[PDB]
């Protein structure tokens with residue numbers, strides 16, 4: 001029963017609320033509204049619609065682009081005081097308010113019930129944007145995607161006459177709003193309405209105890225953390241190491257691999273970081289787990305002159321996950337300007353692509369220790385659901401991620417140049433982007449990159465929405481037109497009505 | 499309420515619960531109990547008391563010693579599921595459950611009400627251990643200590659016949675249980691009973707809106723982050739630089755100073771880290787704030803050959819707090835073995851003390867980039883209260899902290915040896931410890947060091963409890979004897995009964 005908070009520019013809170021994970025994008029709304037209940041979210045939306053104010057929602061503030069914080073946004077509804085996480089006995093499902101962050105969700109579900117779901121590895125990421133986009137992370141090979149556990153979603157929606165209401169859309173075959181549910185299984189945030197809460201549960205959960213409503217993770221993991229110095233690293237070294245990584249991953253990316261429990265992430269930093277790094281984990285209860293880690297690490301070095309430094313240890317699951325998570329505070333999180341890009345794979349990068357990568361990663365006229373591209377193990381259980389049943393593209397065996405991070409606004413041009421040119425040269429056979437084909441599956445909507453709609457950087461002729469949604473876009477457009485006929489919810493990459 | 503959770507070794511959660519911030523201490527109780535309400539805490543305690551079991555409580559798990567996780571502890575009550583933070587209209591105060599962490603508390607208080615209290619800069623620290631010890635942090639010069647806002651505390655206590663009850667003790671002069679309240683304003687955790695929740699408010703708050711019930715921090719700060727290269731450092735530069743810092747701080751540590759708003763921390767890492775580092779901040783609204791920071795930075799450099807690297811920027815308060823905060827995840831936070839020590843000053847270290855420090859900080863036969871001593875600005879508003887009114891020692895102008903962090907158990911001996919020897923040598927004129935005198939004021943109970951009770955390291959004849967509690971120890975023993983007559987709550991540094 002606390003009234004919703006309104007923060008105008010004369011309130012000291014305004015400048016803080018204007019800043020989220022990417023300091024490139026400082027919001028300047030008329031006001032921020034912090035509601036405490038779904039009813040208050042309806043009130044906020046209804047006010048903005050009545051006066052034609054442009055409204056966007058913020059949950060965790062992790063957007064890679066200015067979708068929330070665009071200068072033309074008049075009202076930001078910030079859901080960070082709606083962060084409740086708990087078992088909803090009536091639905092047999094864990095209720096997660098949109099303002100809950102992934103770090104907090106995991107701690108609560110694990111300690112109280114012993115359960116988890118396969119969401120990302122960054123602590124401050126909001127449920128609101130994360131889940132609707134097709135959340136994944138380190139347990140996805142074993143458990144699938146977050147949306148594989150999406151039982152129901154509560155959404156504040158706006159009809160053609162501007163009347164604002166709340167609907168609960170569920171997974172059930174007879175649900176008349178099942179289309180709205182489907183759109184939230186990969187359609188991405190900022191598109192259909194304000195998500196106020198999600199409900200999560202295994203579709204085949206046994207009984208009705210919470211301890212059975214979501215999967216139990218493996219109890220403990222063998223963890224390896226590895227690094228290769230840049231000092232003596234040569235193009236030959238780099239290209240063989242990455243090719244060995246992709247080789248091994250592509251042989252081991254299905255539920256049939258006895259190595260499917262093994263997850264690894266290869267972080268190819270720019271030379272100025274001093275090392276390439278990898279982390280890997282495998283559950284203790286996999287047949288011959290410790291040796292499987294050894295086999296994998298051996299194959300990696302086979303044909304590589306740089307010997308990696310290597311630390312190996314055993315940890316409980318939640319510690320493993322926290323050890324690898326990205327902090328939401330400290331110099332890596334706060335006051336940081338960023339640019340991210342994304343491209344997903346179902347076959348290897350060629351020798352030529354990797355040498356192109358090398359040129360930019362080894363470039364000595366550039367200095368940015370945070371500049372990197374990453375190769376992220378994927379597949380497994382992600383790829384054995386019926387793909388039609390959710391909106392997220394499936395078929396990638398492996399994900400790639402590029403990022404640069406800096407603090408000085410004066411260096412914007414060089415960091416943006418660096419990342420744009422590396423991504424372009426890697427995809428220079430396919431118009432500078434990962435056009436869905438035999439090798440590329442496209443890109444991930446939770447790492448949006450407006451350069452994909454920029455004819456200077458995308459010369460492929462393939463539109464941004466095909467890269468992010470494949471064949472699912474026309475269905476998303478139909479649902480959008482049904483549920484947001486006035487196009488209240490929009491941004492540079494929002495689903496365009498027909 | 500959901501029934502309290504019981505976790506025995508057959509549950510996958512047990513190995514996770516056994517580990518907290520310091521991996522040197524792995525607990526092995528009969529069970530962990532995770533209660534959800536005061537009544538469930540009473541029940542947990544009443545069980546343990548009945549059968550004579552040794553019980554300890556964990557909130558955030560940041561204890562620097564094995565007070566919670568001793569091998570002889572039979573039951574650990576983990577309060578991490580009691581983390582509510584909210585305004586309590588009936589008391590006109592903010593209610594904070596013991597298991598709320600400080601990072602969380604700040605975010606809730608600030609975004610919802612625009613207020614804060616001066617607690618520490620580490621994200622995962624639990625209210626439960628933190629407040630009762632006299633928590634401080636970067637705003638303490640301006641706002642005082644956390645315990646300067648302690649309106650009331652709810653504690654589960656055990657009488658002489660072993661009957662368990664709950665009491666609320668308040669700061670009001672006529673409160674029959676004001677002694678219990680006073681004990682929680684510096685007496686420290688694990689002593690008097692199980693703290694279930696705290697209430698916070700300014701003693702002179704206007705009216706009863708929550709926006710007035712705690713102080714508003716400054717809206718924004720100028721921040722300076724400085725580093726000096728170890729490759730360029732000599733002994734004489736080190737001695738002069740630290741001397742410059744101490745002199746400036748000791749001229750500027752009272753509320754009378756026009757620089758009182760400037761807070762700075764100097765981290766003197768071991769050579770293997772590659773640099774000394776300092777962060778400083780001053781509110782933007784202080785008269786001539788930007789210039790005051792320049793004046794300060796110039797004084798540090800006078801007579802010092804090494805030029806430091808420096809970045810300066812302006813940030814909102816919560817952002818500057820988060821920029822400097824220590825993460826609760828990532829490699830620095832998880833799976834780490836640690837040893838900490840503490841020494842507080844009201845006068846400067848001598849030149850010989852500083853060359854003794856240089857000797858251990860440049861020692862090339864040691865390697866640990868996490869090893870450091872720190873000098874932490876303090877005083878101001880902390881020292882303008884009636885000191886009798888709380889249990890915390892007051893009088894320090896400046897705090898110092900020593901830490902070594904590592905991961906391999908094989909290295910324990912050399913890290914423990916390094917921190918013990920540096921601290922002993924720095925304090926060799928006073929038997930290896932900061933005996934309260936004209937320069938030392940003692941040490942902080944929230945960085946406990948069992949070496950102060952070890953006659954091999956403490957040769958001063960001054961007992962651990964004098965060093966941590968000043969002259970307040972016998973009054974605390976009297977309160978202990980009244981409120982925990984059976985000595986149910988104890989650990990190596992617990993208040994001993996009269």
Ligand SMILES: *Cc1cc2c(nc3c(=O)[nH]c(=O)nc-3n2C[C@H](O)[C@H](O)[C@H](O)COP(=O)(O)OP(=O)(O)OC[C@H]2O[C@@H](n3cnc4c(N)ncnc43)[C@H](O)[C@@H]2O)c(*)c1C
Nearest residue numbers: 059060061062063120121122126128129130136189190195
């Ligand atoms: C910053 C960051 C992002 C990460 C990280 N690691 C990830 C991982 O391991 N797996 C992943 O699957 N994704 C990872 N990501 C990407 C994040 O998933 C995306 O950045 C999410 O979109 C972020 O969600 P959120 O934090 O809520 O970001 P916002 O900026 O608030 O909103 C994003 C987008 O979605 C809309 N939106 C937010 N909230 C709602 C609600 N309630 N209803 C409708 N729409 C909403 C916004 O308007 C905006 O358009 C690791 C790191 C460090």
Ligand SMILES: *Cc1cc2c(nc3c(=O)[nH]c(=O)nc-3n2C[C@H](O)[C@H](O)[C@H](O)COP(=O)(O)OP(=O)(O)OC[C@H]2O[C@@H](n3cnc4c(N)ncnc43)[C@H](O)[C@@H]2O)c(*)c1C
Nearest residue numbers: 557558559560561618619620624626627633634687688693
């Ligand atoms: C790890 C860490 C500690 C820090 C950090 N920064 C601090 C700062 O900026 N200012 C400070 O003033 N203190 C800082 N500290 C030190 C912490 O204040 C102490 O380490 C606290 O004691 C931590 O409290 P908590 O996280 O709750 O630790 P526990 O290990 O659970 O318990 C400590 C101690 O207290 C007893 N206790 C806990 N909970 C209760 C309740 N509810 N009732 C009674 N007694 C309780 C325990 O049994 C144990 O004896 C920065 C960092 C990174």
